[PDB]
Amino acid sequence: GRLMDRIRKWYYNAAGFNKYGLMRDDTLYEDDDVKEALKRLPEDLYNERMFRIKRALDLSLKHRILPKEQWVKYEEDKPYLEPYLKEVIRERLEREAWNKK
Amino acid sequence: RISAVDARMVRDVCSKYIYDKCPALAAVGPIEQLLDYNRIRSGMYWI
Amino acid sequence: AEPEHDQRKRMGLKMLLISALLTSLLYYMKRHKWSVLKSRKMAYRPPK
Amino acid sequence: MAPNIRKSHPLLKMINNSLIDLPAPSNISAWWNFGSLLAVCLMTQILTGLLLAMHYTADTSLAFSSVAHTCRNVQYGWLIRNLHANGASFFFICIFLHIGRGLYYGSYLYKETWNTGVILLLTLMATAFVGYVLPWGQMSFWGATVITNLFSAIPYIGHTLVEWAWGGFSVDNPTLTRFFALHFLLPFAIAGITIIHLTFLHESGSNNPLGISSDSDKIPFHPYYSFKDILGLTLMLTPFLTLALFSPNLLGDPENFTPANPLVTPPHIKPEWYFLFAYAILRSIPNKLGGVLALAASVLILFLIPFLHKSKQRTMTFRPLSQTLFWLLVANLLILTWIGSQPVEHPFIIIGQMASLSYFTILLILFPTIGTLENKMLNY
Amino acid sequence: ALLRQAYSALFRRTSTFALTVVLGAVLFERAFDQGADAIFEHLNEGKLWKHIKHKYEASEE
Ligand code: HEM
Ligand code: HEM
């Protein structure tokens, strides 16, 4: 049944980064993979992610959040970077394994 | 009116309108290096 | 045991008064400068 | 060179490029003030310490009285003395929040900046340790005794590493004199290393409460953080001075107003508040050696934090699970501190080993685990 | 309007601003001390030596 869904949706609301208007992927720590990934994002998606963040920072400095209306909703969160990120990791795991070879 | 102006006059007039005033600023483009109104505001005083 | 007892408490007093006065002022000053970021507004304007 | 003599000068360029035109995140909070306090705090100890060292006599026959003389006869000596001893506390308080902050917001991901911090902590600990022996009071002596006596539990090179540190057979003048020297020295080592710490830091720049690129919005250190830090200074400095000027000994053990005497072991030998937590974990493992290792690792564990980060996000801002675990740990530490101030008797003994047990578990097993589990809940 | 007077007179010219701080600190000290001692002493009537002093000062042996 829908347990995993209930949970995920819960934890999602629990974390509460949407309160800042951030997407899940907007919060990823920028390790090496994530870094390559972002470099592959289309000009627009990248600028949109950029503003989203700078917005959230200005909020954190102000010690505020977005009004309930603007919070990102669990199912309207677009996972824009994950497709790319997984590839970057695929490519690497390939290279990685191939060099031990 | 122009021959009436002397250094002393220029200083007093510029001080009058420039010194310690809070200015308006318009920046367009790759402006990351220019920054902080505060810093710019403090550039409004002391030689 | 603590001959200074008295002067030390007279000092503690002056310390609070000044401390109070100063923390207040500095709070204002801190707030005054940051006001530029606190009030600050921003919009995203793609060339759609 | 360049237009303004701030960025061209080989020194003003240093003061400037690390405290004025220095790029700082627009949102770093109050938990970022401790770095400067720690710094300030340091300069202050060294200053008060020098002033005290100018009236101190490192000799078992005059140690206790030289201090008393300093308080009773030296102009404002009594004051300087307070500030120094209490400054040690402010220092630790500050350093523990500095650490906490780092743990919570994943600052430790800045590995070098972090490891140097750990080294800073360790050096600071040694420093207060030797410093405490200087007034040569009962606790000073027995504290020195209890602790240094642990090394004899190391194998083979044990009983020797000790009769070497003491410079004799028991804690005596030979030890006192080298401890004064050591204490006079370490603070500089600290300052030194503190430079390195800030250097590695500047490579990456300050992390920030959200844990996402703050290049999108950076501000000049001055005036933002100059002012913000100075405020933080006064805010903290107020209680420090309050405690130091109204309740001078709220923290100090009274047994240290009694000249050290080797023919009288005090009832309860316990460290200043800032060591209690470690004193507790020390006594949790009843086996001179095991207890030592357990103490050792209670602090050396910090070197592992970086490798135990499993979250896909840097900070705990968006990880409610880690948060409570984090606050559990914090509380876990209060309990350990409380236990350290208590005698070795039930219920304390059991409560003691428990906290100890949890302490290592939380940092070695839980945190890493909950973090993994958390990633899965984000569907990552 | 004092604020304006104060601004133009003292706070505008960075040199007079510092001059104000100096003379200002001087006056502030003198008064802040007096008032505080006064508060402290009053708060401790007859407990200080300053008080009981007369009983042995030139009136004994
Ligand atoms: C007495 C020695 C120390 C001094 C004087 C000191 C000073 C500083 C200063 C000035 C900062 C920058 C401002 C701030 O974020 O607080 C800083 C940052 C930092 N310090 Fe220390 N520090 C000390 C000890 C430590 C310790 C014990 C650790 C942890 C084991 C540590 C870990 C860090 C880290 C990770 C940063 C990055 C902060 C961030 O941006 O997230 N420091 N420190
Ligand atoms: C890292 C900074 C320092 C720390 C953490 C520190 C800590 C301490 C501590 C805990 C004591 C025992 C205080 C007491 O309770 O009586 C002490 C004493 C002393 N310290 Fe320091 N100290 C520092 C720096 C210095 C420096 C640089 C000097 C001078 C060169 C110095 C000189 C002394 C002297 C003379 C005493 C003996 C007087 C006394 O017992 O108060 N200290 N210090």
Ligand SMILES: CO/N=C(/C(=O)OC)c1ccccc1COc1cc(C)c(I)cc1C
């Ligand atoms: C010389 O003893 N100094 C003591 C002190 O509290 O100094 C501030 C002291 C006094 C009584 C008992 C134990 C100590 C030192 O104990 C220490 C010392 C260090 C370094 C650590 I890590 C951990 C503990 C538990």
